[PDB]
Design a protein around this ligand. Structure first.
Ligand code: CLA
Ligand code: CLA
Ligand code: CLA
Ligand code: CLA
Ligand code: CLA
Ligand code: CLA
Ligand code: CLA
Ligand code: CLA
Ligand SMILES: CC1=C(/C=C/C(C)=C/C=C/C(C)=C/C=C/C=C(C)/C=C/C=C(C)/C=C/C2=C(C)CCCC2(C)C)C(C)(C)CCC1
Ligand SMILES: CC1=C(/C=C/C(C)=C/C=C/C(C)=C/C=C/C=C(C)/C=C/C=C(C)/C=C/C2=C(C)CCCC2(C)C)C(C)(C)CCC1
Ligand SMILES: CC1=C(C/C=C(\C)CCC[C@H](C)CCC[C@H](C)CCCC(C)C)C(=O)c2ccccc2C1=O
Lengths: 41, 165, 733, 107, 143, 107, 107
């Protein structure tokens, strides 16, 4: 499955995975630390 | 007392806005039974609202006549009156991450410039190389300063230019 | 075959199509592209065209005066200016129905009239005009002046009065005379008018040509002037109880530095403006004695320019060879002039609303709005033209050999840096302004407005507090009652200035907040992107990587074909055409901001702007939608009112705008084939092939398409916003 | 006649649980405009279990369609003369796709 | 090789007529005639829109534009490998041989055509427009 | 393809004619209403452009169960005419009346 | 049409902030934005954007971040396609939000 993992390394798939990751990280940060208007913690 | 802005802990419009939002939420809550799924949701929303207001008033935020928190962008006013976490601290917090992204992408470009087909290493990402550089880009400010002082961050006049220079 | 109309072009006269007519209409004043054009004949035709422009300007002013005198209510408006509306001119439209004859009967008129949003009533009342005969005589005089300038334009085209090429290239003498006489002595004469006519007429005393040699402007006539006792001209100023146009609380002074506003008119003091123009006259008269003329003294601009070469070679050759470049290029001069004129037009707009110079201005809200929007759109167009002609200079007039290493060549040398940094500023400002506005919109949508990004504009607020606004508590320079800047002005303008700037019912340094922050950064994005487009069209004008020989193709040209990836909108003219959209959007943001801030100020509801300008649904809901109600109800199935014309003009501008979309999106090649089909149809239609065209029908050229689409776009933009502005301000006030 | 059809619930993450509106039926969600409730009532559904099993059948049929694409390209792909049987294609798409389909729905 | 005179007794392809043919321009200023010899009766596309049958032997065709004639020329040369030549005809009756002006097609050389509009400099060696300013007519530095 | 010029010329002409006699009617009415002349508009009161063909078709389909579809108990739609169907106090469907505005917008 | 339809019936989509219909106001504004953004691609041409892109590529070459896949402006055809796609999306989504926010409230 060298070719399949080459496909997963393509720009659109890697972009989808990375932005799902970034968006999920931000979403979980905003779930556990809701409404962060200022850096106070 | 920076620009006629009162603290949100002392402003009455801020408390008015809090009770207004809570009144909206409880007027929605009156329609459902004691512990419904909507009732649970609205009680959680009310708790989040009260917590948000308490946490903004606790953070020393300044409020206007509308009772809304106003941020202080100026360093010197933010650092004199304890408003550095509004715009000043998150400024460097952002710049760290943005230089992180830029430095990592730069290092990836420079690393794949050496290959025979550098273009196919840009539509098909070298994921191990990219992850190595993403991990070691945490020290991007120091590495960028040291690459700036060697004269190797910039290219010389090998960049291309139009005929009238 | 060969036609006659484009006399200035044999290539257009030989063009058998309709393109000949259009291009002869649009190449008429590009004198340099005329067939058989000499530089001297060029300058002479320019001189004559300038005389013609002056004649047209003075005729237009004469017509304004004449119609205000004949069909206006100026003699009644001077009686009750706060309550009476100014008439612009009468309406004679046979298409009017009786309801419209009734609805446009305003201002105490006898029939249908137009209400003046021009401000000329306040202006002429401030400068001493009180009767309709004054305006009549002024109109006659300005028509005579127009005829005189027309005759001068004819005369200086005659053989023994055609000036030489060097006479136009005499910069030192022109500058001396235009600073000393045109700027300075003109301001001295205006001071004379204010001292002799306007100020006495504001004190109730009639001074006219019949008696102005028999009345003294000051009880101590010219003794304080020739003795140096100049403060005697400021002894008894007008009181705070003074009612304009009367002797009650008159005052005897003619040159003051009171500062601030006349309390009854909420306008500048006439004695302050007299002293202003006197000081400015002296300064300009001594400035116009700087450059060298036939009398052996003074400067040569070439020496000044060639001497200003920094050591360290930081500017290279500096300004060496720049006198020749500026003096030999009319497009360089024109770009400098348009830049300065547009900047000072924006200055006029920004200062006439904050420091209203005219009596009972700032209470005529429609007039204020119209004047600001007018002068700001004029300034935006002029400032786009500045860079347009800078690009035309770089293409037509710039010699890279005669500008070897000077600042001007040093510009083109690092033009990519300039353009990329303007790109960065535009990109940053757009990203972050739009992001904060969208964040605040989403927060107001989710019912949580306390989560908005409301950045307090503490820098502009600090500036305001430095001018004496005590609302913020900075206590820095003039808000600090212990500073030397504050102490040294107390015998001077500062009492009035600080009573005027701390009054939150005028527009002198309005209170600002986060909405002002966001919209000022939108304004900055607009300025930076407009000048990005314009600078990039001016610096890539002589060539690029895509088209390195672009200078050989001229300023305007359609394209370079679909090769090399595609070269649509490649020329500098296309960069100007793209920058006019962004300019219109910039000035639209500016005037939206102005009009909403002032509509909430005039309604006593500044909280509306302060609470709704942080997100764009507040702009759409509380400014565009809320103020459109009276406008769009100008005519309805239940009748019409005087806002009917503005409703019609609203829809008119929308239509023109959308029609421009036709020329901007749809391009030539669809229309040429359509026109070929129509040609076939006409040639094959019986009873109609008897009639045939003399110019072959063709679709509009690509450049002409862009011009016509941009013209429809801008005209619709302008008419739509003028209709909306007048109807939303005149509907309430 | 009183309950607003809603078939999309929003997660309470960034304050967007305000979109979960009071549509009725002791429910909070997005009032849909698709007409699926009326279509399901016309089909005689009257239960969420039937909708769930229709969803499972739809996923099975989607797997079938993707398998059929893979099969008719990679394993047994029709020749050109098979596609050019427009007479038989029309006969089957009128009688079978639309005729038998309308007959089955009538049933 | 010498200039061939247009034989007007040449037949025309079988065409049922169109609306893309000649207009008043042919009657007023000029139109164009293209001739070719076909080996067999073949259906070709008209540049005016439509399908015509070129006759076995010589074929004459009228057009109101030179681009139409050269489009048909390239079609006949690339899809049929024929050798057409076209003329410019005026309502006066004057015929001007146009396309293989030398007899050979211009993509090949014939050793005897003189070069025109050949600047012997590089395209980046043109002077600035400030040097050709006030040349009478409005001009490009390429002249 | 051989008479495309005629096709497109007549289509262009009908497009221009329709644009005029459709949108210029709206412009005429806007101008008249702004001028204070509602009696000069193309309205159902002043200058009626009644869609009589569509009105006739409406009346014909409404009266179909009486003459031309006697085994149908009612018309296909209530938009042809008749009484309204009210469900939950709200109108499900009711006769749609065509007038001058409908003429103008259909054109 | 401007007053009694567009301006009047917009009172439900612009006043939807703080409601379950606030997403419709948000998409109203965003569709307006996308529509106007289409006009950068429709009113403009490739030759300006290639020169701007090369002046930006200068800044990327200066800092050694010039990509190997050379940045080009969108083709003329692609510029037009992007423009019309954003135009259709913005206009249709604007009408979508307006319609739904209006008719969920009033109906
Ligand atoms: C550019 C304009 C702009 C700006 C400045 C902001 C700023 C903000 N928005 Mg707004 N927003 C914008 C545009 C913008 N937004 C737009 C366009 C939209 C519409 C799509 C929204 C919609 C929106 C909503 C709906 C909400 C916000 C919220 C917020 C806040 C986010 C706080 C947060 O997530 O803490 C995150 C805190 C961090 C510290 C994260 C930093 C990132 C990383 C984790 C730091 C690195 C740590 C470490 C080194 C990592 C190690 C490696 C790792 C892999 C382990 C903040 C005030 C939220 C809020 O509460 O506002 C008050 C919120 O609910 N925004
Ligand atoms: C962007 C320009 C800018 C402007 C207009 C101001 C404006 C001001 N600064 Mg700030 N400042 C800035 C950038 C700026 N600052 C930066 C980049 C720094 C370095 C972190 C500072 C550090 C700073 C300090 C330390 C102080 C100010 C102070 C002030 C005030 C005098 C005034 C409000 C003073 C202040 O607090 O005013 C009361 C003060 O003590 N400034
Ligand atoms: C004292 C001598 C004198 C005077 C009065 C003038 C005056 C003039 N010259 Mg001449 N000129 C002179 C000497 C002089 N020149 C000499 C010696 C030379 C040869 C060396 C020339 C060569 C020359 C050329 C070649 C041309 C002129 C032109 C002009 C005109 C400029 C356009 C104009 O009217 O705008 C004047 C505008 C202003 C004074 C306003 C600007 C000032 C302020 C800052 C604006 C903002 C405040 C504003 C005034 C407030 C208004 C409020 C309210 C009234 C609306 C002007 C009539 C041009 C022209 O039009 O030809 C007819 C032209 O092409 N001149
Ligand atoms: C070019 C402008 C101008 C002109 C033509 C005049 C012309 C005149 N002035 Mg005026 N004056 C002017 C500017 C001008 N003044 C300015 C700028 C000031 C303010 C310093 C004055 C202040 C002034 C006073 C105070 C008096 C005059 C007087 C006079 C008259 C006699 C002069 C000997 C004469 C009609 C005297 C007079 O008798 O007026 C009728 C007189 O008493 N003038
Ligand atoms: C002092 C001011 C000034 C002067 C002297 C000039 C002079 C010149 N300009 Mg510059 N220009 C100016 C201001 C000025 N311009 C400004 C303010 C702009 C920005 C808007 C420009 C933008 C500009 C460009 C982009 C170009 C020029 C060009 C030219 C040259 C010829 C223009 C021509 O043929 O006119 C013919 C002009 C027209 C036929 C007018 C077109 C119609 C306009 C859009 C107005 C239409 C109004 C409409 C009727 C209103 C209807 C309303 C109604 C329905 C109610 C000439 C040297 C051209 C040049 O030099 O080419 C190399 C050129 O390409 N100028
Ligand atoms: C609303 C309409 C609109 C918008 C948004 C823009 C936006 C822009 N124009 Mg302008 N332009 C417009 C209309 C518009 N234009 C029109 C009508 C014309 C006439 C043809 C022009 C002509 C023009 C020229 C000639 C130039 C620009 C430039 C720019 C850029 C300026 C930098 C900036 O603000 O960056 C901020 C960016 C934005 C505001 C747009 C991006 C929006 C968000 C932030 C991005 C992400 C959204 C989202 C996540 C995407 C999801 C995608 C997918 C998942 C569905 C920017 C892309 C300049 C340029 O490109 O140089 C820098 C330039 O030189 N424009
Ligand atoms: C794992 C199973 C599998 C494998 C290994 C292959 C392998 C191959 N197929 Mg086959 N194929 C399969 C399943 C498979 N196929 C199925 C299930 C179908 C039916 C649809 C087809 C139909 C098919 C056709 C018709 C063709 C191929 C072709 C190919 C070749 C290259 C295809 C390519 O570049 O893929 C990479 C492509 C993709 C990953 C795109 C997948 C797109 C999916 C189907 C739709 C997803 C849409 C998505 C929901 C939209 C979201 C929008 C977003 C904004 C949210 C290769 C031999 C092509 C060829 O030339 O073969 C020689 C060819 O013409 N295949
Ligand atoms: C409001 C904007 C607007 C307007 C008015 C038009 C108008 C027109 N378009 Mg254009 N178009 C536009 C936007 C617009 N378009 C846009 C944005 C696009 C997308 C790129 C197009 C794309 C496009 C294409 C692709 C085509 C058209 C076509 C047409 C024509 C069809 C209608 C017609 O002739 O009826 C008559 C004219 C009108 C309805 C226009 C309004 C005129 C009213 C009645 C007022 C009459 C004034 C009266 C004579 C008084 C004169 C005053 C005097 C002082 C001069 C017409 C010229 C088609 C065409 O030309 O073929 C027929 C065509 O093929 N357009
Ligand atoms: C392209 C080109 C051109 C054009 C250009 C342009 C158009 C430009 C513009 C420009 C501009 C438009 C500019 C502006 C500027 C501004 C400024 C520079 C300002 C300054 C200011 C200051 C300095 C201030 C000071 C002060 C203050 C701050 C306040 C108070 C008072 C005082 C004084 C203290 C030309 C022709 C040249 C040629 C070349 C090319
Ligand atoms: C909704 C849906 C679904 C489901 C569906 C279904 C369930 C369907 C069914 C269907 C069916 C269930 C069908 C059936 C059919 C049947 C038929 C079509 C029959 C026919 C018959 C006939 C035609 C007959 C004939 C005859 C007669 C009459 C008598 C005797 C003789 C003969 C036989 C000839 C799913 C899950 C997919 C998902 C998606 C959606
Ligand atoms: C704006 C514009 C451009 C410039 C638009 C650019 C070239 C396209 C930008 C698309 C995206 C932003 C680039 C994609 C880069 C990566 C794929 C994104 C991955 C990383 C992101 C997180 C940044 C044209 O090229 C053009 C051409 C012809 C007519 C009109 C126009 C036109 O209006």
């Amino acid at each position: 499955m060298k070719d399949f993992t080459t496909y997963l390394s393509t720009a659109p798939v890697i972009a989808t995975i990375w932005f799902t990751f970034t968006a999920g990280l931000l979403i979980e940060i905003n779930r556990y630390f809701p409404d962060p208007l200022v850096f106070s913690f | 007392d920076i620009a006629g802005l009162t603290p949100c802990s002392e402003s009455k419009a801020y408390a008015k806005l809090e009770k207004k939002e809570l009144k909206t939420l409880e007027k929605r809550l009156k329609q459902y039974e004691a512990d419904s799924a909507p009732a649970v949701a609205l009680k959680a929303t009310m708790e989040r609202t009260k917590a948000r207001f308490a946490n903004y008033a606790k953070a020393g935020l300044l409020c206007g006549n509308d009772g809304l928190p106003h941020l202080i962008a100026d360093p010197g006013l933010a650092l004199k009156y304890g408003h550095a976490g509004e715009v000043f601290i998150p400024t460097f917090g952002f710049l760290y991450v943005a230089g992180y992204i830029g430095y990592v992408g730069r290092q990836y470009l420079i690393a794949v410039k050496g290959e025979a087909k550098p273009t196919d290493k840009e539509i098909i990402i070298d994921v191990p190389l990219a992850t190595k550089l993403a991990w070691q880009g945490a020290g991007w400010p120091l590495a960028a300063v040291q690459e700036l002082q060697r004269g190797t961050l910039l290219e010389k006049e090998e960049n291309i230019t139009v005929s009238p220079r | 075959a060969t036609k006659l109309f484009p006399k200035f072009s044999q290539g257009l006269a030989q063009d058998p199509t309709t393109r000949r007519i259009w291009y002869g209409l649009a190449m008429a004043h590009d004198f340099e592209s005329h067939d058989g054009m000499t530089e001297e004949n060029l300058y002479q035709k320019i001189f004559a065209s300038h005389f013609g422009q002056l004649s047209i300007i003075f005729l237009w002013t004469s017509g304004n005066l004449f119609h205000v005198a004949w069909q206006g209510n100026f003699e009644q408006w001077v009686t009750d200016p706060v309550h009476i509306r100014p008439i612009a001119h009468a309406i004679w439209d046979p298409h009017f129905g009786q309801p419209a004859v009734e609805a446009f009967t305003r201002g105490g008129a006898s029939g249908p009239v137009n209400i003046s949003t021009s401000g000329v009533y306040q202006w002429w009342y401030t400068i001493g005009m009180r009767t309709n005969q004054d305006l009549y005589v002024g109109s006659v005089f300005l028509a005579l002046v127009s005829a005189i300038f027309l005759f001068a334009g004819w005369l200086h085209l005659q053989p023994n009065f055609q000036p030489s090429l060097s006479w136009f290239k005499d910069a030192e003498s022109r500058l001396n005379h235009h600073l000393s006489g045109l700027f300075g002595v003109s301001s001295l004469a205006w001071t004379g008018h204010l001292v002799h006519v306007a100020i006495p007429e504001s004190r109730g005393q009639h001074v006219g040509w019949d008696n102005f040699l028999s009345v003294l402007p000051h009880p101590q006539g010219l003794t304080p002037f020739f003795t140096g006792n100049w403060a005697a001209y400021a002894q008894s100023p007008d009181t705070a109880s003074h009612v304009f146009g009367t002797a009650q609380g008159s005052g005897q002074a003619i040159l003051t530095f009171l500062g601030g506003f006349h309390p009854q008119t909420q306008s500048l003091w006439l004695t302050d403006m007299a002293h202003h123009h006197l000081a400015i006259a002296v300064i300009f008269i001594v400035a116009g004695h700087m450059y060298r003329t036939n009398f052996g003294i003074g400067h040569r601009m070439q020496a000044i320019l060639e001497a200003h070469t920094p050591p360290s070679g930081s500017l290279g050759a500096g300004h060496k060879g720049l006198f020749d470049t500026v003096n030999n290029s009319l497009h360089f001069q024109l770009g400098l002039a348009l830049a300065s004129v547009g900047t000072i037009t924006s200055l006029v707009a920004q200062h006439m609303y904050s420091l209203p110079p005219y009596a009972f201005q700032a209470i005529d809200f429609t007039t204020q709005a119209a004047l600001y929007t007018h002068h700001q759109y004029i300034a935006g167009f002029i400032m786009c033209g500045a860079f347009a002609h800078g690009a035309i200079f770089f293409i037509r007039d710039y010699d890279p050999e005669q500008n070897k290493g000077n600042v001007l060549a040093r510009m083109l040398d690092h033009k990519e840096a300039l353009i990329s940094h303007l790109s960065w500023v535009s990109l940053f400002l757009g990203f972050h302004t739009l992001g904060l506005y969208v964040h605040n919109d989403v927060m107001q949508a989710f019912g949580t407005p306390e989560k908005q990004i409301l950045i307090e504009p503490v820098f502009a607020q600090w500036i305001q507090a430095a001018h004496g606004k005590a609302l913020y508590g900075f206590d820095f320079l003039l808000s600090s009652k212990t500073s030397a800047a504050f102490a040294n002005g107390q015998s001077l303008w500062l009492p009035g200035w600080l009573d005027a700037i701390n009054n939150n019912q005028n527009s002198l340094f309005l209170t600002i907040g986060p909405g002002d922050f966001l919209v000022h950064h939108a304004i900055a994005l607009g300025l930076h992107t407009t000048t990005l487009i314009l600078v990039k069209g001016a610096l890539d004008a002589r060539g690029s990587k895509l088209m390195p020989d672009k200078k050989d193709f001229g300023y305007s040209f359609p394209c370079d074909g679909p090769g090399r990836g595609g070269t649509c909108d490649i020329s500098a003219y296309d960069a100007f055409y793209l920058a006019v959209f962004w300019m219109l959007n910039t000035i639209g943001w500016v005037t939206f901001y102005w009009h909403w801030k002032h509509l909430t100020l005039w309604q006593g509801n500044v909280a509306q702007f302060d609470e709704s300008s942080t997100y764009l649904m507040g702009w759409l809901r509380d400014y565009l939608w809320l103020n459109s109600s009276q406008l769009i109800n100008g005519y309805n199935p239940f009748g019409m009112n005087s806002l009917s014309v503005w409703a019609w003009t609203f829809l008119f501008g929308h239509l023109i705008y959308a029609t421009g979309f036709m020329f901007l999106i749809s391009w030539r090649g669809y229309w040429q084939e359509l026109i070929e089909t129509l040609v076939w149809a006409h040639e094959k239609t019986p009873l109609a092939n008897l009639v045939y065209w003399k110019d072959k029908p063709v679709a509009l050229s690509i450049v002409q398409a862009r011009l016509v689409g941009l013209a429809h776009f801008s005209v619709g933009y302008i008419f739509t916003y003028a209709a909306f502005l007048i109807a939303s301000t005149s509907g309430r006030f | 006649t009183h309950i607003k059809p809603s078939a999309q619930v929003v997660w309470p993450i960034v304050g967007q649980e305000i979109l979960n509106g009071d549509v009725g039926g002791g429910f909070q969600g997005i009032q849909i405009t698709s007409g699926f409730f009326q279509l399901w009532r016309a089909s005689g559904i009257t239960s969420e279990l039937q909708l769930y099993t229709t969803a499972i059948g739809g996923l099975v049929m989607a797997a079938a369609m993707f398998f059929a694409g893979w099969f008719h390209y990679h394993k047994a792909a029709p020749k050109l003369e098979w596609f050019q049987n427009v007479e038989s294609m029309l006969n089957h798409h009128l009688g079978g796709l639309l005729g038998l389909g309308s007959l089955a729905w009538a049933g | 090789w010498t200039v061939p005179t247009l034989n007007p007794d040449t037949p025309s392809p079988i065409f049922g007529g169109s609306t893309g043919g000649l207009l008043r321009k042919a009657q007023t200023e000029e139109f164009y005639v293209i001739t070719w010899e076909a080996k067999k009766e073949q259906i070709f596309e008209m540049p005016t829109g439509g399908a015509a049958i070129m006759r076995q032997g010589p074929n004459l065709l009228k057009f109101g534009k030179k681009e139409q004639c050269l489009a048909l020329t390239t079609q006949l040369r690339n899809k049929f490998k024929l050798t057409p030549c076209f003329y410019r005809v005026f309502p006066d009756g004057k015929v001007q041989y146009l396309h293989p002006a030398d007899g050979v097609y211009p993509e090949k050389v014939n050793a005897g055509r003189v070069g025109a509009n050949q600047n012997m400099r590089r395209i980046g060696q043109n002077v600035n427009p400030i040097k050709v300013k006030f040349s009478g007519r409005m001009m490009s530095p390429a002249e | 393809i051989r008479h495309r010029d005629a096709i497109i010329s007549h289509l262009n002409w009908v497009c221009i004619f329709l644009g005029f006699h459709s949108f210029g009617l709206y412009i005429h009415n806007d101008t008249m209403s702004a001028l204070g002349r509602p009696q000069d508009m193309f309205s159902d009161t002043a200058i009626q452009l009644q869609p009589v063909f569509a009105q006739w078709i409406q009346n014909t389909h409404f009266l179909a169960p009486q003459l031309t579809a006697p085994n149908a108990l009612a018309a296909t739609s209530l938009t042809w005419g008749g009484d309204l169907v009210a469900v939950g106090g709200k109108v499900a469907m009711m006769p749609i009346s065509l007038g001058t505005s409908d003429f103008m917008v259909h054109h | 049409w401007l007053r009694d339809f567009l301006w009047a019936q917009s009172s439900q989509v612009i006043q939807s902030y703080g409601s379950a219909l606030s997403a419709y106001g948000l998409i109203f504004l965003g569709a307006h934005f996308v529509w106007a953004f289409s006009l950068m691609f429709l009113f403009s041409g490739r030759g300006y954007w290639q020169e701007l892109i090369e002046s930006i590529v200068w800044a990327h070459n200066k800092l050694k971040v010039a990509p190997a896949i050379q940045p080009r402006a969108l083709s003329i055809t692609q510029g037009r396609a992007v423009g019309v796609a954003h135009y259709l999306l913005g206009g249709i989504a604007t009408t979508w939000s307006f319609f739904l926010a209006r008719i969920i409230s009033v109906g």
